[PDB]
Symmetry: D2
Subunit: 254 residues, 4 copies
């Protein structure tokens, strides 16, 4: 009888009530993990939880705005109470970037983008580390973007923050290695979600982006789910400090 | 919970020992029909014996990847026996000898570039038409961490592994219209015969561990899961990608 | 010729080490340079030393973290020289060795602010002036830590990697204005900033072995590439990071 | 005169990028021996640079021939007393062709001339640079090393390979005080690249595709090479510098 690869593991996935995070949450649970979903809006949490509990998956949810230290610490407490520990963290939140010239980006946009996109995952990782230590180790996946390698103009704050996350991933992987905590990164290309709607709103704009990105199709949320589940599993025990691009062939880096 | 490579047919070059053998075993555990192959018939024999004795759908044939005739025959062998080809894993390398660039002969450069760079390109060429007939396929090329972080003393080998990064990219772009995916595995230090020089003395092992900033050396099976995943339709949105399996050893952003 | 003849350059954090070496070189290559840092006394001494070498260098206080200091830096240069051609952004927070587990939220905020946000806003403040000159050159100082972080400095590491992203995104954004944006990424240079890594002689030797280098860098080892990148001889180089690290591993 | 009294070999330096490099090095004070496959190209190259008052001489060297490489080194030593700089610039002309149509002969010639030859040419100069207390090597790769276009797979692979050669040589040769760096040009207007710019319609198409405002010229590559060859770049080794006018490459 083939065993579940995340049998008896406990996972937190932030920003997991829609799109990529939701797709990741579902797969981890499909792969045997107890999962706690969260996002900012309680009405988003309930529907995600209802949908996934509808499928017989070990899933519960709570509100957690990753920008709020209270929420982050409460997310960890909820999971530990319910399941007795934490083995996996997937950090997936990002601030919706407004398209504009760097000359029109305000200081408040910079502050919010760096806070939510860069500081928050660092502090969210800090919050889970002691619990992961108790279990003998763990796995962290940070979600950046192809934009880290290939920036488009108009999204400078967002671009910078996703590149920063390549460093956060590398530096945490080295620091947390003695605790047997692996730290990897998912860098999606253009995935069809509400987040990216501006870029596939029109069938003309979808075709224009495909030609620009040198891709045959846009990604779906579930195209990101398998690699994250693999990375979170003991089968990937010799992979740490690694960013995996899931971009359908769009240019990234060697 | 399905076999992720059910009904798929896979060639793995250089699959009678170490990483290649472990990839072969895992592809077959995940449902694939696998043809294993290497230069020496004796290794092919016991490779097949071992894996068939575990109940895996595996057969073998001799294939030196430097020989056009062997490459073509490997493909013919799989087509005849299974009806087509879905997956190629190119794993062969020339065993490099430690030496200065001042003592590397022209014949060493030629052989290294032939076997390590040209042969995977021609092997892939040999499978493309068969993958086209199945509606697409997956290719995985085995490079090395050396491609990003070369050690002195192995310059021809180092150059060939970096070249393979380029081969993976250029082929992924070329073959995308045929729905063929091309990705690359870049292992760090894995305990095999190939690498024995770097881990035969326990003092050398702990020395390498500190040099490479790792807590342990890899085993062959540490490479199998990612390759089996990349060869699957669960990775349909991953092509042109090199994945490093080096236990944290530095590579690149 | 004098490759930067009649060009006007701002270098932030330019009263010691790398930033001072850059200021000296730009000036030697013909440029009018305005040097600046937080402390007036540091500014005074840097200016005195360079003017005594007959170079066209004046100073002013500018803490790059303060909006008003950045605006005043530009205003000072525009009043004295008539415009701005070159910005080199060189300031960073001094990093303290410690675990991610001990790094406070306040350390994250300050590091991201001074090391990442400030360069972006300092660039914003020089863009309109560079436009009026027909274009210009921006060089951002990051670090080898951007590519090859060591443990104990995570916030600084993350901020330096962010700067690679900033360089690239700004290069693309400002290309239509004929503004080039490139980045210097130094390896271990012997300055006060890095003194924890070289003041003890046995530590220095240890870092050489670890970093795979034959010697540590000196501030002047960084100055030539920066002055080149600011010249019209580099007019087809933008979006580029150049590592000055004595062969220490970085990237392909 | 940053290169005063230095002796520079530049392969494939009778036209385009190699020629612009040879000119600049000579302008910066170096004695330069230019070379390529054809004597009339060499003679024209040499005549033009000598007419500018530069210390340049020439000789024939096909980089694919062991005897030519060694004789190039002997020629420079005989004339000037030693060798300080090597710039390796030669490449086989690539023609658009699907990987399915690339012959094994094209794979061999491309790996030979683009990868093995630079390595063996460096090997040829190393003992001489040792006698001078060190030296500087620059290898010309391409933006194609990072961002390959379809239809040029062998060339693309060979240019990525040169990134590795730069890195492995820089490490191996550092103890002999020999620095090794790489130039990676974007689209430069030369005969080598004519398929991508000769037609104006094609030029505009490539500019859009590469996200550049202009094509490069050969002299756009000269300064960085001369810099890298100078002692002002003594803390730079193992480094590839892209000269691509903003086209994407890498972080
Ligand atoms: N093309 C792409 O779609 C693409 C490409 C590359 C990278 N990414 C990355 O993928 C992530 C976005 O996911 P997506 O594309 O799947 O978007 P999506 O489908 O729109 O989902 C966004 C999710 O984030 C949650 N969220 C937003 N702000 C939050 C916060 N401050 N704290 C906690 N949760 C928050 C939302 O729920 P609430 O509204 O309830 O908070 C929702 O669950 C980002 O990290 C993004 O950079 C996306
Ligand atoms: N081990 C490591 O630390 C490490 C690290 C990075 C990369 N790699 C890469 O991993 C790959 C395999 O290494 P390994 O460590 O698993 O070696 P291994 O355990 O010694 O196995 C080598 C296999 O290659 C076969 N082989 C050798 N030359 C061949 C050829 N020309 N054609 C067909 N088969 C050939 C051998 O069988 P026959 O002798 O019967 O031909 C054997 O089955 C290589 O590409 C290597 O560069 C290894
Ligand atoms: N090994 C290395 O030294 C190394 C390696 C890689 C990168 N770097 C980068 O090089 C830069 C550091 O230069 P360095 O090593 O030359 O340091 P340094 O010799 O100590 O000089 C630091 C300079 O920065 C000024 N400064 C500090 N904070 C400032 C602020 N907020 N606003 C304006 N000026 C400020 C100082 O003057 P005041 O005290 O008067 O403000 C001083 O002139 C940083 O960007 C660093 O990340 C250095
Ligand atoms: N867009 C571009 O033009 C571009 C972009 C990236 C990289 N590059 C690189 O730039 C380098 C030079 O190309 P280019 O564009 O300057 O070409 P170019 O203007 O056509 O000049 C090529 C030079 O190479 C010589 N040559 C050709 N084969 C040779 C050989 N086997 N041995 C010695 N010399 C040889 C030619 O002289 P003879 O005919 O007399 O031998 C000529 O002097 C190549 O390495 C190429 O890969 C060019």
């Amino acid at each position: 009888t083939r065993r579940d690869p995340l049998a008896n593991k406990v996972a937190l996935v932030t920003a997991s009530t829609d799109g990529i995070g939701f797709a990741i949450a579902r797969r981890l649970a499909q792969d045997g993990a107890h999962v706690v979903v969260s996002s900012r809006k309680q009405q988003n949490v309930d529907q995600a939880v209802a949908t996934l509990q509808g499928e017989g998956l070990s899933v519960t949810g709570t509100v957690c705005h990753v920008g709020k230290a209270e929420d982050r610490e409460r997310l960890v407490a909820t999971a530990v109470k319910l399941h007795g520990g934490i083995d996996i963290l997937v950090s997936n939140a990002a601030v919706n970037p407004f398209f504009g010239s760097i000359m029109d980006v305000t200081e408040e946009v910079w502050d919010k983008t760096l806070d939510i996109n860069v500081k928050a995952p660092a502090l969210m990782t800090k919050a889970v580390v002691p619990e992961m230590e108790k279990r003998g180790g763990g796995s962290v996946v940070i979600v950046s973007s192809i934009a880290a390698f290939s920036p488009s103009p108009g999204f400078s704050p967002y671009n910078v923050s996703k590149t920063a996350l390549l460093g956060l991933t590398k530096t945490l992987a080295i620091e947390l290695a003695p605790r047997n905590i692996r730290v990897n990164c998912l860098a999606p290309g253009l995935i069809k979600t509400s987040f990216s709607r501006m870029l596939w709103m029109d069938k003309e704009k979808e075709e224009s982006m495909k030609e620009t990105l040198r891709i045959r199709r846009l990604g779906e949320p579930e195209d990101c789910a398998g690699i994250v589940s693999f990375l979170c599993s003991e089968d990937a025990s010799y992979i740490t400090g690694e960013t995996v691009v899931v971009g359908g062939g769009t240019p990234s880096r060697l």
